[PDB]
Amino acid sequence: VVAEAIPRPEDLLDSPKFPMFEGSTGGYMSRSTRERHAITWTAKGQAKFEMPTGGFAIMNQGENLCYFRKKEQCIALGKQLRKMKIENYKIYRLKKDGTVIFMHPADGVFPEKVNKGRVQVNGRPFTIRGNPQQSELKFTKYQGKGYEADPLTTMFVKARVMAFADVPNLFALPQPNMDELVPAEEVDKYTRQEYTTRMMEALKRVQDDRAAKAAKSL
Amino acid sequence: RVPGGKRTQELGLVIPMADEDGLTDGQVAGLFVIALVVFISAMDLAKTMYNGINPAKFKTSKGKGYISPLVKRYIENGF
Amino acid sequence: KYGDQRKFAAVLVPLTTLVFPAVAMGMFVLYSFQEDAFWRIVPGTKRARELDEAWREHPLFANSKDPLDGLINPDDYEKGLEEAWERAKPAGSTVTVKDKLKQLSKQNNPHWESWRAMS
Amino acid sequence: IFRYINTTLWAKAGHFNKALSKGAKTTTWIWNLHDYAHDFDIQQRSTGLIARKVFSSNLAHLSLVFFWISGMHLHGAYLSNYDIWLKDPKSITPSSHLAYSLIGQDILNSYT
Amino acid sequence: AKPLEMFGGVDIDLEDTPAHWTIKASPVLEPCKDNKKFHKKLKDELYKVKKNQQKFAEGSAAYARFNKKIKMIELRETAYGDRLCGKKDGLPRTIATGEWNVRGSAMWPAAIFLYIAGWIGWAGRSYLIRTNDAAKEINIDVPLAVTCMASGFSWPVAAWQEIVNGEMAVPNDQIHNGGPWNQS
Amino acid sequence: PWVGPKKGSWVKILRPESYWFQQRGQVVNVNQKPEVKYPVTVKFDSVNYANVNTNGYALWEVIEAPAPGPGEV
Amino acid sequence: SHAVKIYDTCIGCTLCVRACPTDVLEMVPASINAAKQVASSPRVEDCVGCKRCETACPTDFLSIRVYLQDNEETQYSLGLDLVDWS
Ligand code: CLA
Ligand code: CLA
Ligand code: CLA
Ligand SMILES: CC1=C(/C=C/C(C)=C/C=C/C(C)=C/C=C/C=C(C)/C=C/C=C(C)/C=C/C2=C(C)CCCC2(C)C)C(C)(C)CCC1
Ligand SMILES: CC1=C(/C=C/C(C)=C/C=C/C(C)=C\C=C\C=C(C)\C=C\C=C(C)\C=C\C2=C(C)CCCC2(C)C)C(C)(C)CCC1
Ligand code: SF4
Numbered sequence: 001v002v003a004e005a006i007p008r009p010e011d012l013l014d015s016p017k018f019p020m021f022e023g024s025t026g027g028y029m030s031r032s033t034r035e036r037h038a039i040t041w042t043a044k045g046q047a048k049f050e051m052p053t054g055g056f057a058i059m060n061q062g063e064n065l066c067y068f069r070k071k072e073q074c075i076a077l078g079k080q081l082r083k084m085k086i087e088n089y090k091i092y093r094l095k096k097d098g099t100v101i102f103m104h105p106a107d108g109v110f111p112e113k114v115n116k117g118r119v120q121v122n123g124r125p126f127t128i129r130g131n132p133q134q135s136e137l138k139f140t141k142y143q144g145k146g147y148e149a150d151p152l153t154t155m156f157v158k159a160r161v162m163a164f165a166d167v168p169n170l171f172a173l174p175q176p177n178m179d180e181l182v183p184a185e186e187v188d189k190y191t192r193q194e195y196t197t198r199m200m201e202a203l204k205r206v207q208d209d210r211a212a213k214a215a216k217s218l
Numbered sequence: 219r220v221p222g223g224k225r226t227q228e229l230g231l232v233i234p235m236a237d238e239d240g241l242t243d244g245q246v247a248g249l250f251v252i253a254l255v256v257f258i259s260a261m262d263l264a265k266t267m268y269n270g271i272n273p274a275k276f277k278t279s280k281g282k283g284y285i286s287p288l289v290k291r292y293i294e295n296g297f
Numbered sequence: 298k299y300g301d302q303r304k305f306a307a308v309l310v311p312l313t314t315l316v317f318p319a320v321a322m323g324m325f326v327l328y329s330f331q332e333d334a335f336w337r338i339v340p341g342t343k344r345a346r347e348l349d350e351a352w353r354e355h356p357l358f359a360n361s362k363d364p365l366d367g368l369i370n371p372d373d374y375e376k377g378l379e380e381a382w383e384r385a386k387p388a389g390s391t392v393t394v395k396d397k398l399k400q401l402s403k404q405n406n407p408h409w410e411s412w413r414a415m416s
Numbered sequence: 417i418f419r420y421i422n423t424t425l426w427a428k429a430g431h432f433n434k435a436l437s438k439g440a441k442t443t444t445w446i447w448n449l450h451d452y453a454h455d456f457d458i459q460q461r462s463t464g465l466i467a468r469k470v471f472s473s474n475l476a477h478l479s480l481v482f483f484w485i486s487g488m489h490l491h492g493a494y495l496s497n498y499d500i501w502l503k504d505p506k507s508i509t510p511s512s513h514l515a516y517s518l519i520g521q522d523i524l525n526s527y528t
Numbered sequence: 529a530k531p532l533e534m535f536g537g538v539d540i541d542l543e544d545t546p547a548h549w550t551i552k553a554s555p556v557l558e559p560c561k562d563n564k565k566f567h568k569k570l571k572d573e574l575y576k577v578k579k580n581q582q583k584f585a586e587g588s589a590a591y592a593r594f595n596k597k598i599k600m601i602e603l604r605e606t607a608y609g610d611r612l613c614g615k616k617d618g619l620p621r622t623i624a625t626g627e628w629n630v631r632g633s634a635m636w637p638a639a640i641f642l643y644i645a646g647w648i649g650w651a652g653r654s655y656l657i658r659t660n661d662a663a664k665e666i667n668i669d670v671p672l673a674v675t676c677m678a679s680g681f682s683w684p685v686a687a688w689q690e691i692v693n694g695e696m697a698v699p700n701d702q703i704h705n706g707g708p709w710n711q712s
Numbered sequence: 713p714w715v716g717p718k719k720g721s722w723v724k725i726l727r728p729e730s731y732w733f734q735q736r737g738q739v740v741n742v743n744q745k746p747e748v749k750y751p752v753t754v755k756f757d758s759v760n761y762a763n764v765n766t767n768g769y770a771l772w773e774v775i776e777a778p779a780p781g782p783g784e785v
Numbered sequence: 786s787h788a789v790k791i792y793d794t795c796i797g798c799t800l801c802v803r804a805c806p807t808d809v810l811e812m813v814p815a816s817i818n819a820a821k822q823v824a825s826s827p828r829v830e831d832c833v834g835c836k837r838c839e840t841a842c843p844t845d846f847l848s849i850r851v852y853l854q855d856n857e858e859t860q861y862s863l864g865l866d867l868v869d870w871s
């Protein structure tokens with residue numbers, strides 16, 4: 001798809017592409033706004049239509065060009081044109097510098113028609129109820145945005161919910177020994193792979209002690 | 219005073235006013251000194267609450283922190 | 298006399314109900330145009346980014362935002378999950394645990410917290 | 417001509433609007449039926465029916481106003497003190513409106 | 529020691545006997561036929577209505593209607609004599625203690641209303657059960673509707689026989705419980 | 713080999729967010745493609761707030777319940 | 786900007802795409818329904834939030850969900866006309 005050369009509306013006064021329209025106060029507010037949206041189309045007959053900004057208009061038998069402040073007005077006019085069997089209309093966003101961005105028929109095929117090369121953006125692979133609970137994701141990446149969680153996080157919190165209901169079989173986290181641990185950070189033994197072995201043996205000692213203590217009055 | 223309401227007029231309820239001053243200017247100034255102290259301390263507290271905790275202080279601030287010996291006990295006593 | 302406290306009032310009442318409120322309103326409208334204005338509730342402020350990074354620099358709060366933080370030995374967890382999936386893998390299925398988790402972590406939400414691009 | 421004036425649509429409530437033809441699935445259907453009752457523009461059939469409905473409804477309302485006038489006239493002839501008001505209007509309050517002596521409603525009628 | 533002044537005006541029975549459990553033994557109330565406020569109120573009613581009556585002509589129909597109203601007022605005075613009214617208002621009271629045997633008791637109206645209200649609800653429920661369609665709710669099947677309306681008289685027995693035989697209620701796992709509160 | 717409930721067979725809905733959760737509805741059709749995640753199509757007598765009386769459910773959200781009966785959803 | 790998410794229950798109606806007044810939604814090929822297509826929201830930065838897509842969605846509960854974020858509003862999500870934020 002080739003973007004056209006839509007000029008800035010303040011530099012294209014009196015263009016032959018402009019349809020005959022009455023002109024109202026509803027048009028884009030100059031002297032305060034510099035971002036304009038332009039919609040172009042090619043018609044077959046001078047059929048009267050309604051401008052999104054109040055007032056009616058008559059197309060041209062050839063090319064047409066209109067400028068609007070908002071993309072919504074351009075899309076409304078596009079739907080109105082498409083109701084009149086007028087395809088091949090393109091909607092551009094004009095930056096303040098004059099950069100032309102091609103917006104509505106982005107890949108050249110209207111969004112209601114399946115086109116190859118598209119990928120489901122903002123897709124979630126479950127029913128809407130499958131979203132994780134907001135309470136589970138507190139102070140994580142998804143603090144108040146449980147609907148933004150990746151499906152792996154949703155499954156992880158679901159498994160956590162499943163686990164944290166069998167209370168008797170849970171493992172209480174041992175209380176840290178603050179007074180005798182906690183040396184200066186430079187005082188470490190390195191041996192990271194040995195540190196997990198130390199984790200294993202210390203947790204084994206904790207579990208054995210807990211079992212021995214429980215097997216006294218239970 | 220011009221009273222309003224039925225009960226004040228039909229019971230003769232009156233509002234006495236002391237002919238003296240109440241508090242002398244010196245006492246009011248003494249109260250205003252401590253009010254200014256409260257005001258300065260409250261502005262400082264508002265600043266601290268607005269900025270919040272700075273965790274990156276351990277990279278620049280001197281000292282090495284401190285956990286009081288009871289706070290350690292409260293840590294390891296449970297939750 | 299019962300008056301003589303109005304000497305304090307004639308200064309304090311005009312001050313605290315006219316001068317202080319006007320100065321406060323002017324200072325508030327000035328503060329509204331700072332880049333730091335309402336940095337705790339308004340998204341995309343510079344100070345919010347600095348505070349988040351300062352929290353992340355603390356050794357305790359490095360991996361605090363990760364929802365999966367906690368696995369003491371993630372290699373053991375992954376190996377056990379792979380072993381359990383091997384015995385339940387349907388017929389000649391070609392999906393492994395590693396790439397399944399990798400593609401279940403990668404979602405496509407470009408418009409999430411995109412306000413972290415101005416400040 | 418008049419052979420098409422049939423009662424078959426009296427039982428078929430909501431016939432006039434094609435949005436109500438699906439049947440009363442919800443209670444919103446009742447309120448919509450009452451809301452579209454006089455909206456002749458959106459109801460089914462051609463524009464001639466719109467004109468017929470508008471004009472005939474105007475005539476029906478005119479008959480209703482005439483019936484109201486007739487009721488006022490009969491109240492004045494048979495349920496009023498218009499005689500004594502004619503004889504002495506400055507001492508008699510107009511009254512062509514009585515109340516039955518039920519539930520003590522008799523207390524509403526006053527000396528005119 | 530004068531409980532009236534001790535409690536700021538209100539008086540206490542101070543006696544523990546079953547004979548005082550009836551409403552008629554209350555010291556707040558008093559039979560209407562020997563209460564001064566009752567006499568004064570209904571005398572004022574008679575006086576006002578009579579004063580209105582004299583304003584009209586003697587031979588008019590309004591005079592006869594006011595005579596009928598006066599007779600109704602006097603009949604009301606003599607009919608409420610056995611009804612209990614407070615020793616300070618004169619307005620007769622309604623008994624809501626389940627007495628079943630006092631003037632103005634609320635047990636008889638309660639029983640009558642509960643019977644007829646259960647009748648209405650049972651007739652409606654029977655019609656809804658026997659017409660399991662929306663078309664039958666807008667276009668009422670009048671023969672079936674009046675059949676259910678007449679059949680509703682035996683509701684206090686049929687409803688209980690359905691309750692105990694598992695034909696009124698439905699297990700919660702067969703109707704929509706409500707909005708989901710969890711899933712993750 | 714047919715998969716899912718038979719056509720015209722009543723099923724109880726097990727989708728918690730469904731308007732017809734724990735209700736019953738006839739099975740219109742079941743899509744036989746294994747790639748379809750929600751193949752079971754169920755129609756209901758009671759329409760939801762969108763005035764829609766039919767919806768497609770997953771294979772694990774219909775339990776083949778009996779007929780509703782008199783005065784029962 | 787709001788957050789418009791499409792869920793697996795989509796059946797490729799295309800009604801949500803047609804109802805959108807700012808071309809936020811589009812149809813992408815897929816293999817999870819008989820229509821072989823699901824909706825997508827590649828341009829939610831233009832989502833005003835009218836929720837017409839939710840009105841048009843016929844699934845039991847909407848396969849497309851729009852989450853309003855008022856402390857997030859941009860000039861496009863507010864439909865600003867008299868004023869430019871660029
Ligand atoms: C709850 C606190 C409080 C409140 C609501 C008031 C209210 C009042 N005082 Mg006052 N006063 C207070 C505490 C307070 N006083 C204290 C503790 C002192 C001793 C220092 C005084 C000394 C004082 C004098 C000498 C005079 C008043 C006067 C007045 C009246 C005029 C307002 C004014 O200019 O005050 C000015 C008062 C001050 C500057 C003193 C400090 C005010 C308090 C301590 C601040 C509390 C603020 C509170 C936390 C709310 C903050 C949030 C706010 C932005 C919503 C008004 C009825 C005047 C008047 O006409 O009285 C008849 C007057 O002449 N006051
Ligand atoms: C000559 C007078 C006249 C005529 C011919 C019409 C005709 C019409 N109006 Mg209209 N209108 C009028 C006066 C009139 N209006 C006035 C004075 C107002 C201002 C209040 C309106 C406000 C109005 C609105 C807002 C709307 C219409 C609509 C309509 C159309 C359909 C009406 C309908 O189906 O309602 C059916 C009739 C009813 C629902 C009547 C119900 C009774 C009313 C609502 C309550 C009255 C309470 C009562 C007075 C007090 C009760 C006593 C109490 C003691 C119990 C129709 C073309 C509607 C439309 O879509 O137009 C195309 C529409 O939306 N009109
Ligand atoms: C004479 C004047 C009068 C009027 C106009 C009303 C009007 C009303 N009453 Mg009511 N009532 C009255 C006198 C009156 N009451 C008296 C004197 C008593 C005795 C103290 C009651 C006791 C009473 C109860 C206990 C209830 C009502 C209810 C109602 C409302 C529903 C109407 C109804 O039954 O629908 C027809 C009935 C149905 C559609 C469903 C059936 C429900 C009824 C109550 C049958 C239940 C029978 C059941 C087996 C026994 C229940 C025991 C216990 C729960 C009380 C209605 C506004 C109901 C209400 O307000 O609910 C919100 C209600 O539950 N009334
Ligand atoms: C005469 C008499 C009697 C009888 C009575 C009766 C029987 C009655 C009945 C009555 C009735 C039978 C009534 C009914 C009523 C009804 C009503 C009144 C209704 C209402 C409705 C409403 C109120 C609504 C509501 C709602 C809804 C719809 C939902 C949501 C929420 C709401 C709330 C909004 C006796 C003997 C006792 C005594 C004497 C007198
Ligand atoms: C005696 C008395 C009293 C008391 C009373 C009481 C205490 C009561 C209770 C009551 C109760 C405690 C009740 C409960 C209940 C429960 C339940 C659970 C119920 C149920 C019901 C039902 C279920 C119904 C059904 C039906 C019918 C039957 C008919 C109509 C239709 C229907 C379906 C609705 C008083 C004090 C007032 C006063 C005096 C007298
Ligand atoms: S309207 Fe709903 S079901 Fe239909 S294509 Fe859009 S998102 Fe999918």
Ligand code: SF4
Binds near residue numbers: 807808838839
């Ligand atoms: S809320 Fe409105 S603008 Fe946003 S995606 Fe839905 S239909 Fe489009």
